[PDB]
Design a protein around this motif. Structure first.
Motif, short mmCIF file in Angstrom:
data_model
loop_
_atom_site.label_atom_id
_atom_site.label_comp_id
_atom_site.label_asym_id
_atom_site.label_seq_id
_atom_site.Cartn_x
_atom_site.Cartn_y
_atom_site.Cartn_z
N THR A 1 -68.61 21.20 -35.82
CA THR A 1 -67.60 22.10 -36.40
C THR A 1 -67.45 22.09 -37.91
O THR A 1 -67.51 21.04 -38.54
N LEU A 2 -67.20 23.27 -38.48
CA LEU A 2 -67.16 23.48 -39.92
C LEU A 2 -66.40 22.40 -40.68
O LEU A 2 -66.88 21.94 -41.71
N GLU A 3 -65.25 21.97 -40.18
CA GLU A 3 -64.49 20.95 -40.91
C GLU A 3 -65.28 19.67 -40.98
O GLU A 3 -65.32 19.01 -42.01
N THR A 4 -65.93 19.34 -39.88
CA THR A 4 -66.75 18.14 -39.81
C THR A 4 -67.93 18.18 -40.78
O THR A 4 -68.12 17.26 -41.58
N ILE A 5 -68.72 19.25 -40.71
CA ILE A 5 -69.90 19.35 -41.56
C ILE A 5 -69.47 19.36 -43.03
O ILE A 5 -70.12 18.72 -43.87
N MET A 6 -68.36 20.01 -43.33
CA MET A 6 -67.85 19.99 -44.70
C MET A 6 -67.46 18.59 -45.15
O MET A 6 -67.91 18.13 -46.19
N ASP A 7 -66.62 17.93 -44.37
CA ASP A 7 -66.19 16.56 -44.65
C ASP A 7 -67.33 15.60 -44.94
O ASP A 7 -67.34 14.90 -45.97
#
Ligand SMILES: Nc1nc2c(ncn2[C@@H]2O[C@H](COP(=O)(O)OP(=O)(O)OP(=O)(O)O)[C@@H](O)[C@H]2O)c(=O)[nH]1
Ligand SMILES: [Mg+2]
Lengths: 44, 76, 48, 117, 160, 482, 154, 66, 222, 56, 52, 110
Positions: D41-47
């Motif tokens: 998920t986007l938040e994960t990959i960003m983090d």
RNA sequence: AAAUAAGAAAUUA
């Protein structure tokens, strides 16, 4: 302190910093007034 | 972005366009946009072997400039 | 770090004040400026 | 799990319940909604991205973390390696198929050809 | 994984309508079926009753029949389909095989080589794809062909 | 504790008025002292850390706002939704509470789409390519993601922009109804008379502005009327004529009126029309009504020998397909006929069905979350089962989820609906967020639900250990003072 | 309301004494909360109750703290005072639940169980279809069919 | 092995017609039905001068009395 | 008027550039389109501003608050290929035996599943049951999303296992698996009494008692 | 009450509701003669006759 | 039981005799221990700066 | 017995009421709640509910329950003096009248 | 009739 102490003794237990070990503790406190003496009607 | 901040009187943070400009300003502004788009495309066509693309900021800035031109024209 | 994090103090310093202080401190060292440093710095300025 | 990795349906003939593949893994495969595995998920990959590019420290998977204060242990060879397919695991399955599987496996206990070439 | 009740409560001292308790044959259990099991009133033991209505094994059997009906009913409401018996030739490539009867072999995958793994048993076919096969007599197609979605088309969800 | 120093940031909105007395929310939403410069270096002003999401008109919602939360004023809520809201949507909006909406990326998409519909005739190519030639969209997903809510939002966007809008807030009021009459002037079709009447009512009052300008191109000018009543000259007037009567007359009037209403809608080619139906998938298969057993139609002497079983045994007769409902007939007529590019169906699916896993007991009637759910248990595929272009919706990703939960908790507490003076009993936001994530799987309905259930968590230890540490620290401080 | 029949009333204290089993069963407490929240009213007494009871449950297997003997009996009396406080905090809740439920039922056109008051509608207990032909407590004869509290349209 | 007539049939689960097909159920005989519904509207307009409530059974529905 | 789509702050700009760079390395799940990337960046910045808000509200709340061998540390027993570890829970000695298969999820979308069904459904959405299954990941200071679990029922099957006893057994199974997987994690777990097994059972049935278990029959003085 | 409930099932225009949403009077009340005004009627029927409450 | 008085509560074996001591009460919240330790340590240093 | 069924009917009633701008029943409900939800006061030392005297009847006897019931019957919630209801009562946690609730917001405007 | 996978807590010889 010894790395051993900080591996095994750094957790909450009845030794270290126990959550209350006893029944019937004070769950809920609030700042309130006192009720009147004998507010309950004796009955039947 | 320079052109944009001429066209809109503002920065990132009734007005559909900057006020009090003479009509010639807007003509020259349009000329400038065409010019930027021009050199953009030259620079792109040149280096095409190593792929070059027009970053989002730039493209959207051109668009908002031209929209301001449009609304100037229609209020006028 | 000055860009993205949000600083927690008991008397918060203005973005500009903090920026200037950093800038000053890098100017007083006789350091040769790297391109990336200048770039980041003026992205600070652009969005202020 | 090992039995199931080397499982082939053509070999199952003439064996009783021994011929049945491992319940959970097989039923998970048979399930179609499992076949599509979500991206990270986007938040994960960003983090993770921010920590390893901006801040110069990768996020360690929980197995690569060194949890002994007094030792440094070799990181297990499966640590960040095994990947995530809902088709493989965790086992998730349709109820119809599960019923059918269970019943079949009971009814077939005695269909075994003992004497084989 | 149902939350519903599948077991009749055990006979005990008379239950009454209370907070936290209801009568045993109360109208709210088993969707009001308990009517069938009920001896109303202050039953006079010596002279009156119907024995089967207090019997644990019998009562539970009845309840079990009722549960079975519930499940059957819901499994049939769950069908949108009929079984049609179609000659081997005219059937789609996936059924051209041998298909073991139910509970005979391992639950079977439709087409492992084409990346479809699902019960062949429960695969359902569209009445519109089998049209040429099922109504050959009709000439002109009776059902108009399915319209399908282009998954390469730029549409609202592709952000264009 | 900066309570008695707290003034209230003067009221512009329904939303700003949703704040309870300080005493109620004080610890729950913490105050802070902000020193600005007027006439003296400070003058201490006490502000709250949190405030209700802004109240934003559909036109003010921008691309920049995606995944944020916005509010709808109460009177806008009355203006735009006299029918109701989507199925569970209103569960987040009790009387004192602010009315929130998470503006999702799909919300922004449909907002753009509607804003183009407003002048469609110019944008015709753009629109047709956006749906790929189909007439509008059907939104589909799991139970309890944003579907009904997304539909609500579309009604809001459409009606604020003054477009004529049908809104069927729940399709089950038609197909799984109270009762079913045979329609009066359409042979072989059926009505849901109660659904129809309520519809004719709210439709009229929602669109009344535009519907009063609408002149009738085809309706008979002879309509039966009671003494002292007026022949309708508007579409509004007609809808009025439909539902205002004493029963039983309402029943036949509504049939006629729905037939002519839809006949009027299909005949208007220049004025954009947005049809929002929640739970389209109920309209695309059978209603739960069954055709009457033919022996109700033939008249009878005795039950003794007619050769009739109607009194002996119950039996099922084929279900009445929804396409034979006169209303749904109208809509299907508009979808299937080409030469109607005036109309846009933004429509929805409902998965609200009772759970069935291969055995069913009997539901306990005290504890049943599903008592008002439908009996369906049959699969629905929006691709094969509708003429609309399908759009898929998932659970919240974490960005949505966080904004939404923050709203539910904090704006709940600000409205006096939450822990209040007891705030120290529940854990901190982060912990709640993480845990409710685990429990809900981030499914929106699950998030709402588990947010309520949080009242009962047993195994959360945070405030306990914090309280303990604060205590220890206070006592060391008191030993150092000594 | 499906459960219509005459019932047996239990004194509030015995209802509360059921603890986790009924009075504080999580499942039940949550849908009380739902009722309040939906009516747009804070549920404070419920939350007090939930706090008290939550903690009751957590320590329910421990032995009570060791008692030293006192002529004063201050300890015993302070424990008692705390206890009856909690009892009263919960009486208030129990009352709230019966109160609001009856009121809400009045709004939903619901008929209560036999011999039950609904303040605006049935002042004396509402009854219909009891096993006994008179109203139990009035000693007045019941009409057939069951008395109606609400006007007809739905 | 005697011929196809003895090859056992295959049992397919064939779905009911889809939503898409069922949509046309409401257009079946469209012309005839509109043309007719105008006549029925006349029948209704007339019947509604006499009586307060007009049933479908006074209009297009047949119910045999005896 | 109009809003601009392009990044507003320096912060947005920086993160936007990062997202571009990620897209060019073709890592899984990254948005290909610039609009999506914008939405992403805005959303992220907003999330971090939220986190800062919660931290502040916490610091303020903190002021107005009302008031010998130790433990056996083992090596890890894990399937080298599948990377799975196996624990078992019990309650009632018979009724509930569970087995947890626990494995690490590198994609950060973890899920717990019981007998092939998602944990939510199996425990009937009741929170006070499911949080018991969350606890071992807490006590061990772990993120539950880094792990995939499947639990298997080896005891008496029943249509519904949602009830607190079954949940106790579940929690235990998960915790034992977790310990086989991350050995050191055993010390917090053991201290919080997760690994500890209580031995309790319904009384055996017995025809002497009325109810079959606890209740002796009526007595009368002669 | 039996044939009435069945007829309602067969009219089909209510359809699934008859057993599920709709409520019916209890057995002994539903058995009262038409015209019954007071509840007492259940107890005023003849006890000399062995019909199992199927008598007036 | 039968025509005789009930035994006092203390005359029955312990109600929880079969539950292990680590379960009554559960010491949960271990996750936080380390946190508060660091915290307190940190605070101590703060309290020196005031003094010195 | 309050059921999820009733909760759904409640939701729909509440909604339909909100949309017809009926503020009155919300106000009756708000009133009721304000009256009976006030925080009960800590009892004075020496004040406890009476138990049933031992050595009166045998422990299995009815009298026990008969006492409990008859006590709680006599203390009706209108007799609860430990909860402060009245016009005299100051209520810091709640809003006083209709004029302070959000649907009045237009008069709150300057 | 009951302190036993349930949930009860303070007046010994
Ligand atoms: N504000 C806001 N709330 C939402 C949104 N999506 C879901 N919710 C809340 O979460 C609940 C989700 O329920 P629904 O939206 O009715 O679920 P659904 O997709 O219609 O699912 P079914 O009807 O059961 O098929 C809603 O009642 C809302 O309260 C959203 O996009 N914005
Ligand atoms: Mg919905």
């Amino acid at each position: 302190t010894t790395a051993e102490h900080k591996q095994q003794d750094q957790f909450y237990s009845p030794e270290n910093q126990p959550i209350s070990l006893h029944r019937n503790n004070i769950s809920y406190m609030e700042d309130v007034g006192r009720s009147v003496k004998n507010p309950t009607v004796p009955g039947l | 972005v320079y052109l944009r901040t001429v066209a809109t009187g503002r920065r990132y943070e009734g007005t559909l366009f900057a006020e009090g400009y003479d009509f010639d300003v807007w003509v020259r502004l349009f000329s400038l946009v065409q010019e930027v788009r021009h050199d953009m495309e030259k620079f792109m066509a040149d280096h095409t072997l190593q792929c070059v693309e027009p970053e989002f900021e730039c493209w959207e800035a051109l668009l908002v400039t031209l929209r301001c031109a449009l609304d100037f024209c229609v209020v006028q | 770090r000055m860009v993205d994090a949000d600083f927690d103090d008991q008397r918060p310093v203005s973005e500009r004040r903090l920026f200037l202080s950093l800038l000053t401190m890098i100017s007083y060292s006789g350091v040769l400026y790297t391109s990336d440093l200048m770039a980041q710095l003026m992205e600070m300025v652009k969005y202020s | 799990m090992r039995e199931f990795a080397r499982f082939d349906p053509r070999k199952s003939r003439g064996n009783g319940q021994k011929g049945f593949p491992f319940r959970d893994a097989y039923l998970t495969k048979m399930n179609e909604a499992n076949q599509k595995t979500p991206p990270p998920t986007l938040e994960t990959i960003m983090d993770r991205a921010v920590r390893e590019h901006h801040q110069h420290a990768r996020i360690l998977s929980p197995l690569e973390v060194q949890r002994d204060v007094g030792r440094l242990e070799p990181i297990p060879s499966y640590a960040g390696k095994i990947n995530a397919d809902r088709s493989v695991f965790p086992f998730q399955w349709k109820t119809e198929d599960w019923y059918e599987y269970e019943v079949a496996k009971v009814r077939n206990r005695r269909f075994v050809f003992e004497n084989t070439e | 994984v149902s939350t519903g009740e599948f077991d009749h409560p055990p006979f005990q001292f008379r239950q009454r309508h209370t907070f936290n308790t209801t009568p045993l044959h109360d109208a709210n259990r088993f969707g009001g079926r308990t009517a069938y099991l009920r001896e109303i009133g202050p039953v006079n033991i010596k002279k009156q009753g119907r024995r089967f209505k207090k019997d644990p094994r019998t009562v539970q059997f009845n309840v079990d029949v009722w549960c079975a009906q519930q499940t059957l009913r819901k499994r049939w409401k769950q069908r949108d389909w009929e079984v049609i018996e179609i000659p081997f030739r005219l059937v789609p490539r996936e059924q051209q095989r041998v298909i073991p009867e139910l509970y005979t072999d391992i639950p079977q995958m439709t087409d492992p080589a084409r990346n479809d793994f699902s019960n062949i048993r429960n695969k359902v076919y569209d009445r519109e794809e089998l049209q040429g096969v099922l109504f050959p007599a009709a000439g002109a197609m009776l059902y108009p062909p399915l319209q399908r979605v282009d998954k390469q088309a730029m549409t609202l969800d592709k952000y264009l | 504790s900066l309570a008695a120093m707290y003034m209230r940031p003067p009221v512009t909105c329904y939303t700003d008025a949703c704040e309870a007395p300080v005493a109620m929310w004080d610890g729950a939403i913490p105050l802070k002292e902000t020193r600005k410069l007027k006439n003296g270096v400070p003058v201490r002003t006490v502000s709250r850390t949190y405030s209700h999401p802004p109240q934003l008109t559909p036109t003010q919602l921008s691309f920049n706002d995606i995944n944020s939360m916005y509010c709808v004023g109460n009177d806008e809520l009355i203006q735009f939704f006299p029918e109701g809201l989507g199925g569970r949507v209103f569960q987040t909006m009790p009387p004192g509470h602010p009315r929130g909406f998470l503006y999702r990326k799909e919300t922004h998409l449909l907002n753009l789409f509607v804003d183009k519909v407003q002048h469609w005739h110019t944008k015709r190519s753009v629109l047709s390519s956006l749906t790929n030639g189909r007439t509008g969209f059907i939104v589909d997903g799991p139970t309890g993601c944003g579907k009904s809510a997304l539909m609500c939002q579309v009604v809001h966007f459409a009606r604020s922009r003054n477009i004529v809008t049908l809104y069927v807030p729940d399709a089950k009021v038609w197909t799984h109804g109270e009762w079913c009459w045979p329609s009066t002037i359409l042979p072989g079709f059926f009505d849901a008379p109660d659904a129809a009447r309520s519809f004719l009512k709210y439709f009229a009052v929602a669109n009344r502005a535009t519907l009063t300008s609408w002149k009738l191109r085809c309706t008979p000018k002879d309509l039966p009327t009671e003494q002292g009543e007026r022949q309708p000259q508007n579409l509004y007037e007609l809808c009025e004529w439909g539902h205002r009567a004493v029963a039983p007359a309402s029943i036949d009037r509504q049939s006629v009126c729905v037939k002519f209403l839809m006949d009027e809608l299909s005949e208007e080619k220049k004025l954009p029309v947005v049809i929002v139906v929640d739970g389209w998938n109920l309209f695309s298969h059978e209603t739960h009504f069954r055709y009457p057993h033919p022996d109700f139609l033939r008249g009878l002497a005795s039950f003794n020998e007619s050769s009739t079983d109607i009194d002996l045994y119950p039996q099922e007769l084929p279900r009445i397909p929804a396409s034979r409902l006169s209303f749904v007939r109208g809509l299907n007529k508009m979808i299937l006929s080409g030469d109607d590019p005036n109309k846009f169906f933004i429509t929805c699916t409902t998965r609200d069905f009772k759970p069935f896993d291969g055995i069913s007991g009997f539901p306990n009637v005290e504890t049943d979350r599903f008592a008002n759910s439908l009996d369906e248990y049959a699969p629905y595929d929006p691709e094969k089962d509708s003429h609309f272009h399908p759009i898929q919706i998932g659970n919240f990703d974490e960005y949505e989820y966080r904004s939404f939960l923050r709203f539910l908790i904090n704006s709940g507490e600000l409205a006096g609906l939450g822990w209040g003076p007891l705030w120290h009993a529940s854990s901190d936001f982060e912990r709640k967020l993480y845990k409710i994530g685990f429990l809900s799987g981030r499914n929106p309905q699950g998030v709402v639900d588990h947010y309520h259930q949080e009242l009962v968590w047993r195994y959360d230890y945070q405030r306990t250990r914090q309280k303990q540490y604060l205590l220890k620290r206070r006592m060391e401080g008191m030993s150092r003072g000594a | 309301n499906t459960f219509l029949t005459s019932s047996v009333a239990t004194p509030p204290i015995s209802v509360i004494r059921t603890g986790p089993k009924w009075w504080a069963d999580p499942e039940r407490m949550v849908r009380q909360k739902l009722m309040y929240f939906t009516l747009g009213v804070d549920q404070l007494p419920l939350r007090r109750t939930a706090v008290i009871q939550r903690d009751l449950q957590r320590f329910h297997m421990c032995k009570p703290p060791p008692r030293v003997g006192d002529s004063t009996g201050y300890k015993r009396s302070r424990a008692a005072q705390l206890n009856t406080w909690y009892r009263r905090i919960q009486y208030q809740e129990y009352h709230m639940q019966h109160l609001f439920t009856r009121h809400v039922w009045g709004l939903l056109r619901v008929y209560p169980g036999n011999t039950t008051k609904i303040q605006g509608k049935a002042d004396d207990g509402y009854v219909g279809y009891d096993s006994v032909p008179f109203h139990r407590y009035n000693r007045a004869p019941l009409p057939f069919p069951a008395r109606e509290l609400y006007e007809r349209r739905k | 092995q005697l011929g196809e007539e003895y090859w056992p049939s295959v049992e397919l689960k064939v779905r009911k017609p889809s939503g898409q097909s069922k949509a046309h159920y409401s257009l079946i005989d469209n012309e005839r039905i509109e043309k007719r519904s105008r006549e029925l509207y006349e029948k209704y307009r007339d019947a509604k001068k006499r009586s307060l409530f007009v049933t479908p059974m006074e209009t297009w529905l047949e119910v045999k009395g005896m | 008027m109009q809003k601009l789509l392009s990044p507003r702050t320096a912060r947005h700009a920086r993160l936007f550039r990062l997202a571009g760079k990620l897209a060019d390395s073709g890592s899984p799940g990254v948005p290909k389109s610039d609009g999506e990337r914008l939405v992403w960046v805005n959303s992220h910045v907003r999330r971090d501003k939220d986190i800062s808000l919660s931290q502040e509200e916490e610091r303020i709340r903190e002021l107005m608050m009302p008031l010998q061998i130790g433990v056996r540390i083992d090596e890890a027993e894990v399937d080298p290929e599948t990377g799975i570890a196996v624990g078992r829970g019990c309650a009632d000695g018979e009724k509930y035996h569970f087995t947890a298969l626990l494995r690490e999820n590198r994609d950060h979308n973890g899920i717990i599943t019981v007998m092939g069904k998602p944990l939510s459904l199996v425990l009937d959405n009741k929170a006070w049951l499911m949080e018991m299954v969350l606890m071992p990941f807490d006590e061990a200071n772990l993120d539950y999303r880094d792990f995939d679990a499947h639990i298997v029922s080896e005891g008496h099957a029943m249509p519904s296992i949602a009830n607190e006893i079954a949940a106790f057994a579940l929690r235990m199974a998960v915790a034992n698996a977790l310990v086989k997987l991350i050995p050191l994690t055993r010390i917090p777990l053991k201290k919080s009494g997760l690994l500890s097994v209580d031995r309790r059972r319904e009384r055996g049935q017995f025809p002497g008692y009325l109810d079959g278990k606890k209740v002796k029959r009526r007595f009368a003085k002669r | 009450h039996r044939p009435v409930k069945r007829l309602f099932c067969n009219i089909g225009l209510m359809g699934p509701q008859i057993t599920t949403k709709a409520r019916w009077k209890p057995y002994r009340f539903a058995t009262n003669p038409a015209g019954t005004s007071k509840a007492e009627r259940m107890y005023q029927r003849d006890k000399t006759v062995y019909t199992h409450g199927h008598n007036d | 039981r039968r025509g005789k008085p009930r035994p006092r509560a203390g005359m029955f074996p312990d109600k929880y005799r079969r539950v292990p001591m680590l379960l009554k009460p559960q010491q949960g919240g271990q996750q936080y221990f380390n946190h508060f330790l660091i915290r307190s340590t940190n605070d101590r240093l703060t309290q020196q700066d005031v003094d010195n | 017995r309050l059921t999820y069924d009733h909760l759904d009917q409640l939701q729909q009633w509440t909604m339909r009421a909100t949309l017809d701008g009926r503020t009155e029943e919300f106000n009756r409900i708000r009133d009721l709640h304000r009256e009976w939800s006030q925080h009960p006061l800590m009892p004075v030392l020496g004040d406890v509910e009476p138990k049933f005297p031992l050595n009166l009847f045998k422990q299995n006897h009815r009298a026990k329950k008969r006492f409990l019931v008859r006590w709680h019957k006599a203390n009706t919630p209108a007799n609860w003096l430990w909860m402060p209801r009245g016009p005299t009562v100051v209520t810091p946690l709640h809003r006083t009248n209709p004029t302070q609730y959000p649907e009045n917001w237009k008069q709150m405007v300057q």
